[PDB]
């Protein structure tokens, strides 16, 4: 026969190889294809769908819908903090289990802007202004509205808009950040502050709630497929 | 030699592979081909040939020709049932061992219309009308002629035609049905009822017989070759 020489890697079974193999059912006639709605071609399409963020992830709220409710009320002071969490979409509990966070945990590196949407769910009679800020790392988390407003921020008026869409820009020294927590690739902090106050008429509940949504923007990408740490097993399922 | 790398599947013997092999008899001169009648190119040609259906498959008729004889006589009432069996061409005893049923038991999936032919074998003086009905599943088997006539059915007059050819249409949620019995792919029921009565003159036997034939129509097909459950062995035949 033709002279050949076998190289290293012969007879190996690499789980990510791409080779042809003989068919066990020659000339099998497959069922005709049928148009089904909702075809998906890339996991980024799933990652780009807004999902409700459990910002209130206290131990007493994770087993109910209170985890998604951000309290807000009329205060007697100024510049109080509403919430604050690190921008760790793949490692922080706040964003870990959303659609974006679940897609991220199948990968090792990520890059791109993050779309944050806040919808005010109080009465139509309520008014108020909020300061939503993103602080790049290097310093700590901002501790007051003065520190928060020195970075990227927007002013949200619930009286004018029931939904504010804040797109957190990608500001990093590297092209990609690790999905797991790593200080070398810290992404910063997201905080919200009272710009003026919640103001309501008589016979209106002063305590209201805000819902936060998260999704990837158009420039988002992931790399280095891996097994997720969210599913595990001890024996085969019978 | 030329550098090569062996992939998984090397040295394996897969019974359905398709490879070339060296000839043990080089330059053998085969006997010339001769035209023989009855060339067969597809098993569906066998499956499309009508065979007599043992509809009367009672324990006392399977060891004689009475299994194929469907009794019919002059009654003193109306709308009596002549016969009824499920449309299970590959799993039901009624159709299991016909030509179509035997071809089907070599496969796992099937699809297409079924041609049912009934030939009246009474005297030429006899007259009568019958209702042949096919009931799709979802309800039970029809229990009377009123229920039977609500589905697909035809009226057969033995006085006008000694042979009626009923083509059972293919009505399924899936493109294919399992050859084995499976409720998810139930095909329905076939029933026959007296439309008016058998009427004969004097000196004519009132009891007559009907023969039923089954065959695949032009749209029939099978998939997933398998070993038949009808032949078995304990030791080699000497």
């Amino acid at each position: 026969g033709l002279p050949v020489m076998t190289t290293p890697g012969s007879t190996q079974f690499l789980t990510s190889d791409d080779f042809q193999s003989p068919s066990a059912m020659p000339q099998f006639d497959v069922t005709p294809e049928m148009q089904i709605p909702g075809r998906v071609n890339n996991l980024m399409e799933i990652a780009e769908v807004d999902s409700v963020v459990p910002v209130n992830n206290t131990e007493a709220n994770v087993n109910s819908l209170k985890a998604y409710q951000i309290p807000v009320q009329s205060n007697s002071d100024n510049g109080k903090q509403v919430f604050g969490f690190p921008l760790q979409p793949g490692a922080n509990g706040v964003l870990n289990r959303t659609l974006l966070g679940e897609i991220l945990n199948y990968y090792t590196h990520w890059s791109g802007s993050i779309k944050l949407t806040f919808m005010f769910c109080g009465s139509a009679m309520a008014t108020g202004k909020f300061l939503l800020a993103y602080s790049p790392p290097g310093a700590g988390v901002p501790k007051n509205r003065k520190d928060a407003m020195l970075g990227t921020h927007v002013i949200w008026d619930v009286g004018l808009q029931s939904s504010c869409v804040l797109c957190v820009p990608w500001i990093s020294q590297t092209h990609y950040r690790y999905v797991v927590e790593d200080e070398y690739t810290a992404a910063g902090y997201i905080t919200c502050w009272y710009q003026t106050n919640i103001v309501v008429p008589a016979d209106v509940q002063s305590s209201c709630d805000i819902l936060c949504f998260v999704s990837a923007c158009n420039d988002f990408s992931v790399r280095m497929l891996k097994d997720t740490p969210f599913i595990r097993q001890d024996t085969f399922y019978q | 030699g030329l550098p090569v790398m062996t992939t998984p599947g090397s040295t394996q013997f897969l019974t359905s592979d398709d490879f070339q092999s060296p000839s043990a008899m080089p330059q053998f001169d085969v006997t010339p081909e001769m035209q023989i009648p009855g060339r067969v190119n597809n098993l569906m040609e066998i499956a499309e040939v009508d065979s007599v259906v043992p509809v009367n498959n009672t324990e006392a008729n399977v060891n004689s020709l009475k299994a194929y004889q469907i009794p019919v006589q002059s009654n003193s009432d109306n709308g009596k049932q002549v016969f009824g069996f499920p449309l299970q061409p590959g799993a039901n005893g009624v159709l299991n061992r016909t030509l179509l049923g035997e071809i089907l038991n070599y496969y796992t999936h099937w699809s297409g219309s079924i041609k049912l032919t009934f030939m009246f074998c009474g005297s030429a003086m006899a007259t009568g009308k019958f209702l042949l009905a096919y009931s799709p599943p979802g309800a039970g088997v029809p229990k009377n002629r009123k229920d039977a006539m609500l589905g697909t059915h035809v009226i057969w007059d033995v006085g006008l035609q000694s042979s009626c050819v009923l083509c059972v249409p293919w009505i399924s949620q899936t493109h294919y049905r399992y050859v084995v019995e499976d409720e998810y792919t139930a095909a329905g029921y076939i029933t026959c009822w007296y439309q008016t009565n058998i009427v004969v003159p004097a000196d004519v036997q009132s009891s007559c017989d009907i023969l039923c034939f089954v065959s695949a129509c032009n749209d029939f097909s099978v998939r997933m070759l398998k070993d038949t459950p009808f032949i078995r062995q304990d030791t080699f035949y000497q």
């Binding site: 026969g1 033709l2 002279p3 | 080089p26 330059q27």
Partner: peptide, 17 residues
């Protein structure tokens, strides 16, 4: 392949058929 001599010597060729 169909027919290609892999060697430089005629004795290496397959049979004459």
């Amino acid at each position: 392949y169909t027919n290609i001599n892999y060697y430089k010597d005629a004795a290496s060729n397959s049979a004459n058929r």
